[PDB]
Symmetry: D2
């Protein structure tokens, strides 16, 4: 927080929203007991109607008690309009029956938002890919010219990566979509198992099949690792935008608005600042992942060490990821692409990108692979170091030119060959209407 | 590495096994082209029958080549039994068509073993849980006596955690059960799409729907995070054994063998050494997860930074987890339980563990929660301070004994009350009736 | 933030405080140029007198510019009371000349606070150690009874660890106590090297000997690793308090106030909640450390990826550490110690802690080590499993009792022997006035 | 591990070297007791002269003992040449008196080697910086052209970073240059304080002022964080080489050997493979740092969880860093620089890099900053859009050419201006005049 927090996600993590969730858990729990016949219907009707809290009082009481949940229930007890029935608030419950169930309910909400952000990002990627299906450009391996590809295929790669991440996310969201109301040490000793079933059902959560004082933190570790993975996928794509905007390359550029200023001292600057910002946040979220894993080995039926960490990392990770998904989705959507610079750059390594095809054709004419490679390599290295065209050199090279005709040589130097399966890949990905 | 490495897993990571995997990918790729009609059946028959490699020669050639895949294919071409058909080896393939596809193949073998280990460990936890289903002991929260539970429910919690981990593992194993043979930058420009399909199917791998020169490393990051999560679950259980074996409590002890010595200087020692060992290895694996995440943001259609890192972390994590699952499963299996110590320990906090039951019964009789709590708390704190039994203090307060019969007071102090849902939990878990 | 933020540290990280630091950098820079004679003294006098900013305007301008520093300088330009001299604000500067120098100045302030917190914690430790110099208790290795030590020596260990950390901290504080004003790419091309010397001197910073657009992030990585180390030392000590407060053990207890409530459902509870909270925060700060290291490989003369991460981790780490040092120092200071429970616990393993001394005395009487160990071990293991006193068993054991007299046996069972060097250790540490 | 392991460092981590270190600690401890008068000189003379061990026998004994130090001392006692004086081996010592003291001894050997490597690498960077002190090239911020710098200043920045790392390393090496021989729980109860002093001094170690059964792991965490910081500095430099070798820019290339092959399929490739390799190993080492931090919170007077972890990370980190320092130093030494490409590239952004110089000169002539900036920005953006030279656009604006003479305009577009303080920086760094 706070320039990295959008309003939708910030709102779910307020104290107000937390205490509201606690109150709802408590009231549902009394309603469950009343269904069982263990406490009177009339008592709980009153609790549902009149039970409330004043946050400032919660905090005042907490100054004495040094205990959140006790402060909360004692504050609820002082609601103008509750009478004796206040008796039943927290009946049979332990602290984390409320805290963990409420926390899972809040995460359920966060995860609905994140799922929607992720689906929207996938659509943006799909739309960009279709736009640049045949936008030809150099493929680069080790940062060096390899062979041609298209910007659409690059975006199609990202699209498919994010679909993998949507699936992973659903599984992670599910592992934390659970509540527990099993009492002090998870035994149900003081609280009928039906109470948990009812409360969880009414919050859209599953009931933990077995619990201690708390939910088990393997769930939250799985969850954070998935958040960190999504962020790290986004960093991968941001790193790519940054590389393509480099001045020698300029195949792409982040949208630059009227009135924008790129730097304080250099009026000419247009920078990939959005993508750089995403890179930073991905690092923070990976740190949260390490924290989450360290929260797993809790002692016995619990220690509370995870809570102080989760107070930080759960709001911060979800807030940051929501911000990243929305901001970077807009960066991609509004991204300027320069097909002319892409084609020009394919020119800049003297046609050396055709070296494999010359080699493979030599093999077709019955040369052994290492013999073909070793004829072609010195020619390629000569072009590098004397900066003369590679086709010239193979044409002026008589042991190739004895095995390949001129029209065979020319076919080796045609980039169109490399576009032959773009449509078939897109068809697989679902990116056509063929 | 090597006191922590079992032969079953060590065998799948030898160099010889890698290069055997590489050879098979090459031969299958040739066989695919022959089915396409693009290379003579005659030629591939000879390749399948005779292609081989000498491993010392691979290393010799790499000294000059500074390139392992080239060293490999050149070594294959030196196979005396191969004639000119050697021309076809690696035809249309890029380095990593072999390396990544073979790596996934080796990982599939590793994962078959780890799934087996996970399933053996789940079974060990089930047997132990059933054995100790009614072994009464203190539940502890914040390390301090809370209310009774059973050792079986503690073991059942580990069982269900490992079931969650098995499902996580199946997802993770699947995300890396993929191959690619799409040529230099993933375009199929030099290699018919059918070759990939043929090769992957023959190795039991899915074909990446879209690739570059490499598989995308979000997969390997998901995978490593799941290995680390399993390790961290094992740490949690290991820390519990270490806690329960502490001298003041001694509710459990690791099996101590005839001829074993616990320390160099103190003949009386018996230590939770196995558990301590698991804790250290979990730390190591969590480090490997961070490494894997940092491997995701590769440049463009790939950089090779992930390779050096994967050579360390992929064998080391799989070897270490296989060792941990086996060693810790044995620790649990052979673990010594002291139910008499467990019962003794429930006695040591003066019956204070029944404080909740007295408070709740007081609410049943009409007291508001804060009134009940604040009657009971001082008596509780008095017992801590004074070494007198909580029950006696409860029986001396007229405003309690006016509302509770002796029967009812006596019910509060019965631990059998706390075992009332052990069976209902076990039934959910599937742990009932054999 | 925010229940984990004390007012001293929160105040330095406000936007207001940041923009004030930016303004001071800018004014100092104009004052330097005027010393050089490059801009008129009268112009800069006016800038020193009248230059200011309105934060709401900074933010409004930033909406257009999408650029912090430009928004700031343009806002400064609109100060009622600056005239033409506004010309010279940011003259020769690049953005991060201001941002990095101002950030280092803010960190200097944070680090003055942290140093004082650390010194205060060291004093608290020293005072507690002197208090319990001869407070005898069991030493435990692998969680199991080893030999006696004293609680003073335990605290003396912590004291010495924190002195190591004060030294590490000074070095870390120093590595980040540097500014740069070297212009767009660190060349001084547009800004005389004297400007940097003057500004840094006037902010209590060193001038970076060589810089790019930014300070190098190895410094901030070193810095965060030290913050994380201090937090992790505190976790080590918190883990110890938690272990010693366990109900079977109760050698120590966190202070519990009149009116405090230990749990919501269990009135008897007194928990080590402070120590548990410290454990959680140490995990968060270690995550920040991983983030900081990932900030090091910046591209060329900089990318801005570090900034979005540092906006989070630098305030959060320093705020959290300041909170930890103050809170945990008060936990130790106010900690209840139970010397009677410590002495009682030394009793609970049947005198087995004397096994080494029986062994060593056997060796003195001319037994080979393995012969002495192997006579003593079964006796020790018999006492464990039949729960009878170890001294009885050695006394009733005729191959010891033939080599050692009764008064030699009795000397082996004297704990006073183990206190003989407490004073000599304390003398070394500086914890005496001998 | 093993293509990444040099003999110099591999040799210090063999088992034989460990056990030799263990033997020497034992013999020195006996020699100390003899100087005290507590064991006969006669006896220790024989121990020093004859004590040995068979390594296969250590492992045999450990199979039964499940304890390596006991297996070691029992193996020493089987030395045929030793008589009853074998009685004294390990007298008063605890397991870790040997293991930790010997570990620090081995680490001291490792660190002598790493300091040597660090110093060799600093020298390589100095030579390269001096060679290229005036090799003009673009400075790049956010990956985009900013202003000119020199390759020598870039190398000088690495030089000074490594000097910071050398000082960090000396501090870290020192924090682990410590031994302990204080008995079971650090009390000297069984072992005269003089033994420790004697042993440490003879091994070139400091004696821990206070210890437990082990040295405190804050030391090893400091140490590992410094190893990771060096690795991460190397990554940063490696990423720069990889950036500059990209095909569009080609300002640098790793040395490419006769007979080397860059790829299996593309004979034209020359890749920054060394640099890519360093990047991967830095990731691994950062993982080991996290592990080391998790080893700090050991229980009470120790648990052994750190041991299994240290067996992996201490050899692996030191071996990997020694490999990285040597390999990357060679990469830099042998690196190919293309100053003609560097000059060519400065041309590719239409002279826009001189935008700041025109703006500042306009301020010199009386324009307010926002006025100067906003005159210059549109011309800059016009040049980007239109492929016309910035200088020509500047010369067509009357409100510029009315204030600047042709001389002055021509000065703005001179890169020599930007080399004016290269020497002043080099002098600070100590890089001048040989």
């Amino acid at each position: 927080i706070s320039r990295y927090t959008r309003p939708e996600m910030g709102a779910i993590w307020t104290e107000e929203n937390k205490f509201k969730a606690w109150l709802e858990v408590e009231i549902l729990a009394c309603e469950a007991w009343a269904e069982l016949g263990d406490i009177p219907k009339e008592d709980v009707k009153k609790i549902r109607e009149h039970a409330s809290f004043d946050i400032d009082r919660i905090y005042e009481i907490e100054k004495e008690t040094r205990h959140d949940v006790v402060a909360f229930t004692r504050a609820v007890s002082e609601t103008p309009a509750l009478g004796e029935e206040r008796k039943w608030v927290h009946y049979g419950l332990t602290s984390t029956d409320v805290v963990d169930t409420a926390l899972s309910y809040i995460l359920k909400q966060a995860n609905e938002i994140i799922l929607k952000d992720l689906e929207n990002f996938v659509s943006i990627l799909a739309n960009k890919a279709k736009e640049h299906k045949y936008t030809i450009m150099m493929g680069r391996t080790h940062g060096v010219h390899a062979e041609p590809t298209t910007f659409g295929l690059k975006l199609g790669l990202w699209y498919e990566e994010m679909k993998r991440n949507v699936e992973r996310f659903k599984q992670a969201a599910n592992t934390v979509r659970v509540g527990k109301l099993s009492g002090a040490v998870g035994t149900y000793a003081n609280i009928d198992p039906f109470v948990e079933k009812y409360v969880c059902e009414n919050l859209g959560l599953e009931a933990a099949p077995i619990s201690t004082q708390t939910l088990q933190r393997d769930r939250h570790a799985h969850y954070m690792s998935t958040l960190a993975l999504i962020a790290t996928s986004i960093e991968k794509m941001a790193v790519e935008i940054r590389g393509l905007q480099k001045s020698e390359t300029r195949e792409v550029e982040e949208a630059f608005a009227k009135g924008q200023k790129g730097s304080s001292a250099m009026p000419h600057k247009r920078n990939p600042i959005g993508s750089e910002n995403m890179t930073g946040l991905a690092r923070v979220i990976r740190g949260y992942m390490m924290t989450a894993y360290e929260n797993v080995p809790l002692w016995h039926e619990r220690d509370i060490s995870h809570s102080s960490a989760e107070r930080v990392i759960l709001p911060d990770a979800t807030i940051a990821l929501n911000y990243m998904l929305n901001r970077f989705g807009n960066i991609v959507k509004n991204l300027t692409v320069y097909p002319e610079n892409m084609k020009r750059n394919m020119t800049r390594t003297y046609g050396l990108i055709y070296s494999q095809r010359v080699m493979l054709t030599l093999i077709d004419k019955g040369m052994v692979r290492e013999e073909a490679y070793d004829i072609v390599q010195p020619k390629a290295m000569e072009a590098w170091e004397t900066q003369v065209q590679f086709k010239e050199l193979v044409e002026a090279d008589e042991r190739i030119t004895s095995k390949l005709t001129q029209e065979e040589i020319n076919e080796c130097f045609n980039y169109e060959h490399h576009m032959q399966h773009v449509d078939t890949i897109f068809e697989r990905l679902g990116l056509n209407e063929a």
